[PDB]
């Protein structure tokens, strides 16, 4: 049920985007499967121009289906903006406008599924066309080219950051809002309560995606070492290409979402600090 697996992003104020997590993972999986299958042989490596153009075409089609939910999405932005710029009517309004966005996504599910299946059929056809001269000595050069091109730099980027310290910094910010809210004994209190509730949900999703990143970074690093500078039997090579495509897709989904949610958290934190300023300095 994709209704329970949708992330909501607000990277900048007045903006809203959604990610149906199972579709993001699925499209990314067949993207990695497509590149591994063509990079395997020099005679097929040149098909990257056509793969890049097909993936671009699939992304535009997916975004065209997402655009069908734009009026409902913009209606939800207007309510969030009203609830953040100072109540039960507004909180009721927010809950039913968010439910409407999830219903709109759910109403066009087969449209998304049709696009996901085009990507699967494309990735699977290339994967089925994978051939070895000797099915006992299948080279793994394609696994290395695809890892160097699409994965390696994301692993380095992750390892250069302290994602656990980022979580700790976010809990410190949330605790300071709780402290301010506790000792505040108004309409401003209701907006401080609503913004803090959004930030805590955003934080819980950041912590969820961060756990997946830390786990898949160790797994990708260990598994790449076992699947390169070696030959495999054809069936073993195919299974290890599906295994890596799965590992990469789970990692990339969480990495992309954690960054989008991190931006969403600090955009709401900047707005909350302005409310704290107007309430303390310009009001009481």
């Amino acid at each position: 049920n994709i209704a329970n697996s949708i992330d909501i992003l607000q990277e900048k104020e007045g903006h809203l985007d959604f990610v149906i997590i199972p579709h993001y993972t699925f499209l990314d999986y067949y993207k990695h499967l497509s590149y591994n299958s063509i990079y395997h042989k020099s005679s097929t490596y040149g098909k990257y121009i056509a793969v890049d153009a097909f993936i671009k075409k699939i992304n535009e089609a997916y975004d065209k289906v997402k655009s069908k939910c734009n009026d409902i999405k913009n209606d939800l932005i207007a309510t969030i903006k009203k609830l953040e710029h100072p109540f039960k009517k507004m909180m009721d309004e927010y809950n039913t406008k968010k439910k409407k966005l999830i219903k709109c996504i759910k109403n066009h599910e087969n449209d998304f599924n049709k696009i996901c299946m085009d990507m699967k059929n494309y990735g699977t056809n290339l994967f089925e066309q994978l051939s070895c001269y000797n099915n006992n000595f299948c080279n793994t050069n394609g696994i290395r080219y695809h890892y160097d091109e699409y994965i390696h730099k994301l692993i380095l980027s992750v390892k250069s950051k302290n994602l656990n310290k980022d979580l700790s910094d976010m809990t410190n910010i949330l605790q300071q809002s709780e402290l301010l809210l506790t000792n505040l004994n108004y309409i401003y209190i209701d907006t401080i309560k609503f913004i803090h509730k959004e930030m805590k949900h955003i934080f819980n999703r950041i912590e969820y995606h961060t756990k997946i990143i830390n786990d898949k970074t160790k797994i990708i690093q260990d598994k790449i070492k076992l699947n390169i500078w070696r030959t495999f039997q054809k069936d073993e090579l195919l299974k290890r290409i599906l295994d890596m495509s799965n590992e990469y897709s789970l990692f990339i989904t969480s990495d992309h979402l954690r960054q989008m949610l991190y931006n969403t958290f600090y955009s709401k934190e900047k707005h909350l600090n302005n409310i704290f300023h107007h309430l303390i300095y310009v009001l009481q």
Partner: single-chain antibody
Amino acid sequence: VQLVQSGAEVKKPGSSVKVSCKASGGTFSSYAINWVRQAPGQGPEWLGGIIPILDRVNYAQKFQGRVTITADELGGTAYMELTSLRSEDTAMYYCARLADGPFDYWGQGTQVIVSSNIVMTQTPLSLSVSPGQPASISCKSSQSLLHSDGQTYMYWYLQKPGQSPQLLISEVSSRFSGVPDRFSGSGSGTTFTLKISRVEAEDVGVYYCMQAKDPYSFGQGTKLEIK
């Protein structure tokens, strides 16, 4: 990527020399870096290599004990330390990502002045032609270059004056990107041929065959000059 090596050296016999190789992008990702030297009167000679992601080193038997190859853990720098230097060690030393599909690139070379299983036989040693004349270079290996995977690991390099070697043909007959159609490769097993339908001034330099069936060994070279 581009590879940048440390500067020129003049060493006494019995001393050590350590050459560095930095990747422009900061990493060697999951690929290999190999060290190849070239003495004044000889063809290239492979010393050893490293796959930094695996921490796997491979050394040429004649250099085992004298060569140590290392890599920076997260710094994108490879090293080659040659100890107990002799006058025979005077050479241009190169680090390279050797003949890896569409990837072949070299460092600028490090001048060091001291003050194999598969043997490659190249023919002829020198070739003098006028522009437009065809040219042919042969290479014979002591063992077959055909691998159980169905690839024949035969390569052709051209080293132009004042330049690092450049890959022309991969796995017997595949022209590298940018290589004009006048260059062509043929052969199987142990006998291979590089042809130039018509020679042009820019073709001048030393051509070397390289085998990667038992990585790595090279031919002595074919110096091609105009008129």
